Amino acid sequence: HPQGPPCK
Amino acid sequence: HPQGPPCK
Amino acid sequence: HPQGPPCK
Amino acid sequence: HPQGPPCK
Amino acid sequence: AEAGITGTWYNQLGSTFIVTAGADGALTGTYESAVGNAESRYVLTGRYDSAPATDGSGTALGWTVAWKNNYRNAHSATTWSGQYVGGAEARINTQWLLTSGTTEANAWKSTLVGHDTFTKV
Amino acid sequence: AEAGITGTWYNQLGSTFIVTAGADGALTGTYESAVGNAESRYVLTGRYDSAPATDGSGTALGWTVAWKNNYRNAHSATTWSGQYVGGAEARINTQWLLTSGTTEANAWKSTLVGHDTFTKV
Amino acid sequence: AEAGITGTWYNQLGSTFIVTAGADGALTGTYESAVGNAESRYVLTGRYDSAPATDGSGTALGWTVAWKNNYRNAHSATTWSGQYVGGAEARINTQWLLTSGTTEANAWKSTLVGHDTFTKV
Amino acid sequence: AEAGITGTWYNQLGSTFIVTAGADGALTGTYESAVGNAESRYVLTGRYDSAPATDGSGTALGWTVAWKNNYRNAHSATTWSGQYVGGAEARINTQWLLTSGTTEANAWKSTLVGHDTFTKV
């Protein structure tokens, strides 16, 4: 979801 | 508060 | 999830 | 309220 | 959605909300408190997420109302988050957050949570 | 507030938000997701309640972001409700509601709740 | 309250909850998911705040259900916070928080919020 | 979890909570308000969902505190929903709902929402 932290 | 029901 | 409505 | 910070 | 959202909505407490859903996700309108006197009206601004829906999902949206106009300054703002479901009986189901500006000591008690369901009737 | 709110804000996850607080309570700007690539940008619209504050209270505000732009359509919208505290270390403390459009059967699980703190640094 | 709370309660989704309100604020019982099969039953524990009420207020209470029993382990827990209103049509109005255990990266999406109304019918 | 949860936890406001996590998901203990005077202590009861976790997820739990003891009757109850993360710096991240008993007219404003993080230090 665009609202989260980086996924990295 | 303006967001409530009537106060009546 | 057990907290939901029937899935039916 | 008992759940708050100290009032101090 | 969009055309279906535009219009007057009423909730179970006696509040009325009138919105125009613009082509590119904008939501603009006014919220009116009970009594319905000339200015129990506040400005509301929000957005909705329009999509192709092949499975009958609702349309996600949200809006904000700052409780200040020329007759009242309640030093608070409310945001409603929910979805629009259209059809015979279209409705907007929401959950809201109402925050009051407080001093740092009262910040713990600054936000109330609730839910509202709006219909066209 | 207003002048103090206008600017760039960052939260603890790596998101950036840029707003202009207009004279009559309007909040307009863009929200950017982590990575910070060209368009992880979404439009945000909101309102703030401006008042005379003789006791150091915060300024109540709220805004909405629909997660749809020209690269993504996440079929959801988030609203943030909170207050702005200015000064040496100004910050916006919020609680948010993120609702996804669902079918009626999944409406029970359509909304997540969280909190975010934004700073100018 | 207490005697009035003890009993079976049903919500609008088809869930049943059976509680015993003990003399000193304890709430103990079981929650049953729809279908109503032998063990769609989970243990619930909570508390209620008993008081003299000379103005018809509700009785504040809350309870928790961990979604684990001998047939299911949903790795989550839900808490309901609300008040009991007794009378002809007694009901318990609540707002709930359902949290799933997640890895740190998904902690932002670990909690859903909703509301439930329970009646004796 | 369980052994890791048992113990004293402190939050950022000065509250202390002491729990025993029982073998079959029970959470029993006391919550103490700031000052830490003899009885700013209230009983807490809750549950946690224990599971095998091969991916470092947190343990979901929740508990309730009714704000009534022999010195105070605040006519309210709070529920905390969250997860326990153990390790060097174990913590319990929660979101809470505090409901006050109100008359039907004030039911809209009966619940506040917030968040708390608890540590062993």
Q: Determine contact, residues F1/F21, Cβ cutoff 8 Å.
A: yes
H-state helical runs in H3-59: none
Domains and CATH numbers, chain G: 1-121 (2.40.128.30)
**Long-range CB contacts (within 8 A, 24+) of F71-75:** F71/F39, F72/A2, F73/E49, F73/E51, F74/A1, F74/A2, F74/E49, F74/F100, F75/E49, F75/E51, F75/E57, F75/E60, F75/F100, F75/F101
Residue in chain F closest to E80 (alpha carbons) equals F79
Q: Which of H86, H26, F83, G5 is nearest to E98 (CA)?
A: F83
Q: What residues of chain B lie within 8 A of the CB of E98, using their CB? A: 1, 3
Residue in chain E closest to G82 (alpha carbons) equals E114
Question: H-helix or E-strand containing F100?
Answer: strand F91-100
Q: Per the CB < 8 Å rule, is H114 touching E111? A: yes
d(CA E29, CA E43): 6
Q: Determine contact, residues G120/G19, Cβ cutoff 8 Å.
A: no
**Looking up tokens 């002809």, which residue turns up?**
G88
d(CA H38, CA F63): 44
**Looking up tokens 């989970």, which residue turns up?**
G42
CA neighbours closer than 13 Å in the CB half-sphere of residue F41 = 8
d(CA G64, CA F54): 42
Deposited experimental method: X-ray
Q: Do chains A and G touch (3 or more CB pairs under 8 A)?
A: yes
Resolution (A): 1.7
Q: Is F80 annotated as a binding residue?
A: yes
Q: Determine contact, residues E9/E119, Cβ cutoff 8 Å.
A: yes
Closest in H13, H67, H72 to D5, CB measured: H13
